[PDB]
Design a protein around this motif. Structure first.
Motif, PDB file in Angstrom:
ATOM      1  N   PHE A  35       9.130   1.693   4.865  1.00 14.13           N
ATOM      2  CA  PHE A  35      10.499   1.985   5.389  1.00 14.13           C
ATOM      3  C   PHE A  35      11.632   0.950   5.118  1.00 14.13           C
ATOM      4  N   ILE A  65      -5.637  -6.209   8.307  1.00 18.38           N
ATOM      5  CA  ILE A  65      -6.685  -5.247   8.204  1.00 18.38           C
ATOM      6  C   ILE A  65      -6.836  -5.134   6.818  1.00 18.38           C
ATOM      7  N   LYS A  66      -8.192  -5.299   6.418  1.00 19.00           N
ATOM      8  CA  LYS A  66      -8.665  -5.178   4.753  1.00 19.00           C
ATOM      9  C   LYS A  66      -7.711  -6.007   4.284  1.00 19.00           C
ATOM     10  N   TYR A 124       0.208   3.827   2.832  1.00 19.43           N
ATOM     11  CA  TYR A 124       0.808   3.382   4.146  1.00 19.43           C
ATOM     12  C   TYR A 124       2.250   4.042   4.308  1.00 19.43           C
ATOM     13  N   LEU A 173       0.839  -1.310  -0.052  1.00 21.81           N
ATOM     14  CA  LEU A 173       0.062  -0.002   0.192  1.00 21.81           C
ATOM     15  C   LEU A 173       0.819   1.089   0.109  1.00 21.81           C
ATOM     16  N   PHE A 215      -0.429  -5.300   8.206  1.00 15.78           N
ATOM     17  CA  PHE A 215       0.409  -4.261   8.716  1.00 15.78           C
ATOM     18  C   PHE A 215       1.578  -4.532   9.669  1.00 15.78           C
ATOM     19  N   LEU A 250      15.609  -0.963   4.633  1.00 14.00           N
ATOM     20  CA  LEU A 250      16.976  -0.890   4.623  1.00 14.00           C
ATOM     21  C   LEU A 250      17.742  -2.187   4.152  1.00 14.00           C
ATOM     22  N   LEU A 283      10.997  -2.781   6.578  1.00 12.83           N
ATOM     23  CA  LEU A 283      10.690  -3.113   8.024  1.00 12.83           C
ATOM     24  C   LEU A 283       9.260  -2.707   8.582  1.00 12.83           C
ATOM     25  N   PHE A 315      -3.496   8.406   8.365  1.00  9.40           N
ATOM     26  CA  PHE A 315      -3.560   7.361   7.395  1.00  9.40           C
ATOM     27  C   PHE A 315      -5.016   6.710   7.325  1.00  9.40           C
ATOM     28  N   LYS A 351      14.747   0.853  20.199  1.00 11.14           N
ATOM     29  CA  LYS A 351      15.022  -0.479  19.514  1.00 11.14           C
ATOM     30  C   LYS A 351      16.303  -0.227  18.685  1.00 11.14           C
ATOM     31  N   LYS A 380      -0.660  -7.184  12.096  1.00  7.50           N
ATOM     32  CA  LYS A 380      -1.999  -7.093  12.109  1.00  7.50           C
ATOM     33  C   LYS A 380      -2.611  -7.116  10.669  1.00  7.50           C
ATOM     34  N   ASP A 398       5.405  -2.926  11.647  1.00 10.39           N
ATOM     35  CA  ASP A 398       6.509  -1.882  11.747  1.00 10.39           C
ATOM     36  C   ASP A 398       7.702  -2.822  12.788  1.00 10.39           C
ATOM     37  N   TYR A 399       8.713  -3.241  12.284  1.00 10.32           N
ATOM     38  CA  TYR A 399       9.487  -3.646  12.891  1.00 10.32           C
ATOM     39  C   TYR A 399      10.743  -2.725  13.705  1.00 10.32           C
TER      40      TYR A 399
END
Lengths: 129, 129, 129
Positions: A11, A119-120, A8, A5, A124, A13, A83, C11, B117, A117, A126-127
């Protein structure tokens, strides 16, 4: 290239790939295939990433993102790790014995401990937390 | 000015500085020096920020971000607080007795309870959670 | 239109509205009125959103965001749900018996279990975690 998406954000690396991985088994045919990777926190391969082992709680605890932009250990020992993104569940398979373009029940079932998570129809994540 | 990862993004807000702080001890020489600040949740100085006291669990619980863009209590009683960023670990020192440009082991050791983190030599944080 | 902090980012995604809701009671007069919505995880109305019931722990656990851009069940059965934003506390009321433009103590008191953080007079939230 795995869809994600745009709204959204992403990010990502680069990380060094673990040399002891049979990375060739982590493609799919013509189709995209996302999978989770974990980082070695310590030891000789510290900071190197490898495909998460869902049956190892320490591997699960050290997930660092998903491989969404392919990999090529022979052309480059670094892999781009995303991530944070939102990825349709159909594209993520955590194993060689996992059909492409079909949601992986092992991932869906482990989403709570993986910090995913749904969703739709997207994971989703975010580590960076 | 403390470096931070542009790709990750930054969210920052101004906060009133706690007047009872010897703010002058929270510079470094010519070099940048990031530190964590906490907010007073209640009381007469509510909403004011002060340098986090790592030995006080309530200070740790109320961290609100890092000071990354310097401060000048005499020129302005507000300080820009970065609530979300990724900052190289070498720049963060939480104390006067902490050498500049050297990772602070007190911060690294307290990263779990600080909600930091460490990834690829950076502290990632987001105190809007 | 409920104000929100542009700097923080937003978002949002559309969701189908739960047909069994008296949606007309979830306006305010000329003034904006934000409220929390939860998603049905399963069942016949899965993926549909409804106003969070703060007295039902499962409703609280399944909050998915705030309605910040109005709604119109008769003109469109979808509502734009903001999953991540920073919203001034004066605009959020979780009930018909809640004055507009006044912070709702029921929301403020439940902020921990709602995963809301109040900073500088705004609720910060991100229901993609």
């Amino acid at each position: 290239r795995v869809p994600r998406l745009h709204a959204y954000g992403v990010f990502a690396l680069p990380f060094p790939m673990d040399p002891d991985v049979e990375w060739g088994n982590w493609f799919a045919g013509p189709h995209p295939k996302a999978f989770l990777v974990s980082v070695h926190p310590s030891g000789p391969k510290a900071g190197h990433v490898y495909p998460t082992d869902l049956s190892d709680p320490d591997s699960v605890a050290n997930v660092i993102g998903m491989v969404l932009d392919g990999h090529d250990y022979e052309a480059d020992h670094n892999v781009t790790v995303t991530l944070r993104a939102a990825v349709p569940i159909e594209y993520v398979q955590q194993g060689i014995e996992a059909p492409p373009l079909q949601p992986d029940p092992a991932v869906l079932n482990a989403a709570p401990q993986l910090k995913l998570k749904v969703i739709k129809g997207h994971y989703f994540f975010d580590y960076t937390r």
